[PDB]
Amino acid sequence: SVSQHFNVYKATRPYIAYCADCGAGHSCHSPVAIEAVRSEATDGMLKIQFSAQIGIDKSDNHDYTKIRYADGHAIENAVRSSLKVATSGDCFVHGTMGHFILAKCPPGEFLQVSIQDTRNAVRACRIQYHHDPQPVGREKFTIRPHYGKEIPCTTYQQTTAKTVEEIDMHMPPDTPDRTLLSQQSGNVKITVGGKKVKYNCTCGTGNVGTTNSDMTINTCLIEQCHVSVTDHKKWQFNSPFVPRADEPARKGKVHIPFPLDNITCRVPMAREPTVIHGKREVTLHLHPDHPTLFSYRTLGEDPQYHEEWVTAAV
């Protein structure tokens, strides 16, 4: 079932990753950080991978109008009608599944993906990607014609079934935090907050370990202790921007959606050229509407081949 197709995603969770330039020429730790962009399709439908998943609510259940994202140590929720992808203008989101957005875009140099926070703020991550597609065939058109030819060309489907390719996922590491420490005269207090916390300290002896409650240690300073969240019962994508846990062993694999499929896609026929006869010569008047490739050769012993990209009438 479609809901049953999410059986895997019960074991995963969003993450926070580093956008070098995330809207205003500033580096930030965004929850919508871009990881990689794949453009193997001939049609030109980009597939984008980013930290936040789409299709899971915070209660880990199917919903097609809702996005779950990492925020602090928690998982917050946002609406899907607040998703924007853009290269230079405005882009069209053909499909979306979990960690992936399947979209189609006009030519440009940069790529930006943005969503809306629960506080009605805008979170955007934007990177550099030289996108300039050329359609299959021998003409660089821009819009399908209503009369032409069908040529085989490759695209990405919307099926969510099992696919051969896979993505590795591993165990999330400890997340440093400092907002879990307070001063009381001459002692330091740490609050559990509902999650297991690991502490290391240098005041006295035997002040290292792990806790699940509010602890107080006397004769210690704020700048003298470290606390970090440790539970991490869920899974996380292996990304080169988040440190790897102690265990160097892979924890699992997860299928990725939108495989590559062979379809038939449309091209227009060029206008016939004007032929003027002559003594062992021909004169061709060429009237192109788009950049079109023109080639010719002779059927003798040694041929005089030629080919060029005609753009204007010649």
Partner: protein
């Protein structure tokens, strides 16, 4: 066309870890000393250097 697989980096606090060779195409491993990783919460390890 190829793809470059890079796993999440390993960080050790107050310790040195050496990496051994492997039988993989164009495997490249390196170790670096004196690093102070940061995260969205704060410092990662006590050991400054």
């Amino acid at each position: 066309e190829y793809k470059t697989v890079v796993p999440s980096p390993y960080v050790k606090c107050c310790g040195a870890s050496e990496c051994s060779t492997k039988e993989k195409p164009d495997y490249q491993c390196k170790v670096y000393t004196g690093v102070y990783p940061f995260m969205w919460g704060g410092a990662y390890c006590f050991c400054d250097s």
